[PDB]
Amino acid sequence: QPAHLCFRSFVEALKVDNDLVEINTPIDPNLEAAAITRRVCETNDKAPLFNNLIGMKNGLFRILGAPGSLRKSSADRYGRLARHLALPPTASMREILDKMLSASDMPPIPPTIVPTGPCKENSLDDSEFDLTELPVPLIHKSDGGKYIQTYGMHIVQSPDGTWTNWSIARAMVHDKNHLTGLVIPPQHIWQIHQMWKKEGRSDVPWALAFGVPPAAIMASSMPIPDGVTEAGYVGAMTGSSLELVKCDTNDLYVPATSEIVLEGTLSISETGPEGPFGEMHGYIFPGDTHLGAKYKVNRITYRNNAIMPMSSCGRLTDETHTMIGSLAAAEIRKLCQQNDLPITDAFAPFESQVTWVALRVDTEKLRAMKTTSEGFRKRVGDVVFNHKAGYTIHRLVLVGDDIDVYEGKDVLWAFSTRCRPGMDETLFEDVRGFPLIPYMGHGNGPAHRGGKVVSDALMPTEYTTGRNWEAADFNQSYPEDLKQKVLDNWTKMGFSHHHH
Amino acid sequence: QPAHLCFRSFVEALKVDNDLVEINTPIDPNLEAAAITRRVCETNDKAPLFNNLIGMKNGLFRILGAPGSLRKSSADRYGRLARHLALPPTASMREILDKMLSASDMPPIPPTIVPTGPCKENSLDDSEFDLTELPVPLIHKSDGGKYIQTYGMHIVQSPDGTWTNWSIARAMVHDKNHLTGLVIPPQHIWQIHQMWKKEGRSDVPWALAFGVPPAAIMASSMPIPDGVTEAGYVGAMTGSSLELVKCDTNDLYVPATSEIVLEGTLSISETGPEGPFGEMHGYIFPGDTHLGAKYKVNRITYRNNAIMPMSSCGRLTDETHTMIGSLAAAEIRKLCQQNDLPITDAFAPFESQVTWVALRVDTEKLRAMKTTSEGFRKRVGDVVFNHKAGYTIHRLVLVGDDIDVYEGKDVLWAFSTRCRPGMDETLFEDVRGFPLIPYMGHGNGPAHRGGKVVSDALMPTEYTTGRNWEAADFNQSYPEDLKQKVLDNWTKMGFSHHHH
Ligand SMILES: Cc1cc2c3c(c1C)C(C)(C)CC=[N+]3c1c([nH]c(=O)[nH]c1=O)N2C[C@H](O)[C@H](O)[C@H](O)COP(=O)(O)O
Ligand SMILES: Cc1cc2c3c(c1C)C(C)(C)CC=[N+]3c1c([nH]c(=O)[nH]c1=O)N2C[C@H](O)[C@H](O)[C@H](O)COP(=O)(O)O
Ligand SMILES: [K+]
Ligand SMILES: [K+]
Ligand SMILES: [K+]
Ligand SMILES: [K+]
Ligand SMILES: [Mn+2]
Ligand SMILES: [Mn+2]
């Protein structure tokens, strides 16, 4: 099976790429696996595959860390991501995000039901497993639980059957047969949960699939629209219908090649302690436990030699930056275009801890709008900050066409030199806020509301007559023929490869 | 003579350091020299010495570019700066700034007058030079003039004789015997000029010395207090009295080893066209010429084989970032401490285009103040933004003790995650603004007023009971003995020098 359609094949692809380190000696899931993974993510090293995990029994489980993290070289920086999507490993961010957006104007390709698959190679019923006996990792020293779920896909369906959502949300072991996790507004798992709670008749049928098709875990991390079934979006994006098998104990369907599948229910009534967790913005607040959603596990099925993917998330750079930030930015780009805003590109700079999105403006189109910064800032912020795709983002930075939003140094240059604090900004207090940012949930104001801003780094003539500067840089402040002379004589004169 | 006391010796030191490229074939001062220098500054390469400058006659002049720019290696990143100050080339920023501040609580060491020096080896009177015939560089393709003065020191004295100021301010050739340049409030050259204008009797006696003692050009770029003669501050900092010789045509004194000296007057009445220039924030606005101060040159004296230092300034990284930003930050650190604010460190992040200063707070001291963010932000902003040392700085970022302000990634992390936009900020509109920032002089509001902000990246418990998080990083989220195991087994397992 192709790498983008089968996690086991994705692991092979990373090996083949010289992007994997296989560790075959015993590694402790209590912190060691995650510490190694953390170091990988902070240094952009090869992904670690822990084949000898202390506490692994009857095939559960090996761990792959850093599945969506960065490579060291600039030329294949995003290559792990590219390998989720059948793209060349040198694909740019723009190409990755375009691939992720491509299904938005295509018919869905619904999934195909098949009678079995590798995820049925082994099973454990309700008398045979104990989640506290599996080698679930402690990912950060102060975590409030062993976070089994950092890179699997929750599967829940609306009561009417018309929408089946796939998404990543964290969860940790509660006891032998339960998890607790985050289920928070405006996320689709929360929206579906609320539908079941209003109906009031039963707990939500649920599955959690680990080691799913890489193209599916990417969509699972993207805020595609309300009511859109991710399986059909992934089918359209990849050009192929995904193969799913039915759960044994419920009527949900899971990818056939899933490494590990939990089947059970998400309670409409019960909660349990959840967190704290070392989170995407780089912090953990020890002791900060709160009631979270509670899942009951009735069945486990799994591949022979099952592999659990794991995100050791925190400070730069890991899946919570490369996927949450970039895929939200992608959706925001589309949302602005569909609202008739002249946005060409969007990216969440890593330097902002993916709390900003830079929006590149087609300033020829802006000029024709015959508008002002105040009016344009307000329009952009109202579109983005009132929508779920803007949930995680607290600062939007508007930049003109000279800026590559995929280059954080250029975004920071433009922000710092073109946006006058206060005057060139509009604050938004009456919008949903992202509580996980420390300045929100642990800050001075409401954890769930406000704290957002549009920062206009467009210069005044970009609204009127056009850009009226040149950069004081090598590229723009010297003619072409001089530049090329300099370059051609560079090493000759005494001064100092793309791939590397 | 030591490198910090003699520019010619500084050039040797750079050679000795393997930090110089000597270019002995013809190089055009019309853009080529500055283009090469620009490329050096954007890539942190070796400093260029142009020994064969097209238009060099009778010894005027060779050019040294990038005198205060960065080296590629992390271990001696600031080594050019260190070589201005007799520090080891591996000196940290903290050590450099401490050296620059050290004279603030020492008695001045006044200069020593000597009868001659190398700067008298050659002279050209009022019938023998023409500034339009010298190989003055065109530094950026759209500049409004040939900027002879990017790294020399203007020398002006108060009418009463009690204060002699040394400072860098740009100037360009106007005609055979005049320059025009910036002379703007609140700068000391402007403050002294105003004293002469109020007296109304004569033009200001003036000298401009190029290739001065490196320790003197550093002080020339620092906002030491009003009324303090830089020569005595440099004497105290270096432990030695600087040797000066009298000008021929006026009673000012110049460093004995100056490479090139202009003597003349700064008009109290006349102005001439000045600019535009490719400036420190990375831009030039073509055509944006304004009336500037006008200098008359009556005499040139110079060393045999004189060398003109040149800053090819603009986008990162050059002297306008390494010296303007860092030395302002240094003075701001001291100013806050003298105002009883618990600031331990200050630095202007390069990523902010040196428009921000990050202030590291001793949070134990802050706790004992029993204050709040609103009150503390206001106090800090009032101290800094009402003072000349804060002139160039538009955003102050307050951070706690865990942040290394000399590390821009950490400042950006803290800003982005700990400062809630709006709520955690105080805007300052009734303070002097720095017009050279594009969003000021080419922006939506008053060019000279406002646009400043204090952004509080202290978390709430840092004011009360103490830090209540741990970072989700390798350093803080794993015990010491695990960390060290990981490190010790890193290359063994398969994963990947300080000097490089
Ligand atoms: C990539 C990724 C995405 C996480 C995530 C992580 C990763 C690695 C973790 C597990 C390591 C840390 C926490 N995560 C959560 C999360 N969303 C959320 O509601 N709760 C979370 O706990 N997300 C973001 C979530 O997947 C996106 O917001 C999706 O848009 C949600 O899908 P939906 O649009 O269908 O609701
Ligand atoms: C290092 C450096 C400092 C420049 C400078 C440059 C460099 C390389 C240039 C020449 C390349 C670009 C423009 N510069 C000017 C400037 N200050 C100013 O008033 N006008 C300027 O034109 N400065 C900053 C000035 O030197 C500091 O603000 C000093 O504190 C001024 O000294 P003072 O405190 O004695 O007034
Ligand atoms: K999703
Ligand atoms: K603006
Ligand atoms: K000075
Ligand atoms: K704060
Ligand atoms: Mn969804
Ligand atoms: Mn001064």
Numbering used by the authors:
A (entry chain A), B (entry chain A): 4 to 499, 502 to 505
Please share excerpts from the published article on this structure:
The UbiD superfamily is composed of a wide variety of (de)carboxylases acting on aromatic, hetero-aromatic, and unsaturated aliphatic acids. Prenylated FMN consists of an FMN molecule modified by the addition of a fourth non-aromatic ring joined via N5–C1′ and C6–C3′ linkages between the flavin and prenyl moieties. Following binding of prFMNreduced and formation of holo-UbiD, the cofactor undergoes oxidation to form the catalytically relevant oxidized prFMN species. In the UbiD enzyme family, Arg173, Glu277, and Glu282 (A. niger Fdc1 numbering) form a conserved ionic network.
However, when Fdc1 is incubated in the dark, activity remains constant for many hours, even under aerobic conditions. Hence, we repeated the purification of Fdc1 in the dark, revealing that the latter exhibits slightly higher activity (kcat = 9.3 ± 0.1 s−1) compared with the protein purified under ambient light (kcat = 7.6 ± 0.2 s−1). The respective enzyme preparations exhibit different UV-visible spectra, with the “dark” protein preparation displaying a prominent feature at 380 nm and showing subtle differences between 340 and 385 nm compared with protein purified under normal light conditions. High-resolution crystal structures of Fdc1 purified and crystallized in the dark reveal that the prFMN cofactor is exclusively in the iminium form. As illumination leads to inactivation, these observations directly confirm that prFMNiminium, rather than prFMNketimine, is the active form of the cofactor.
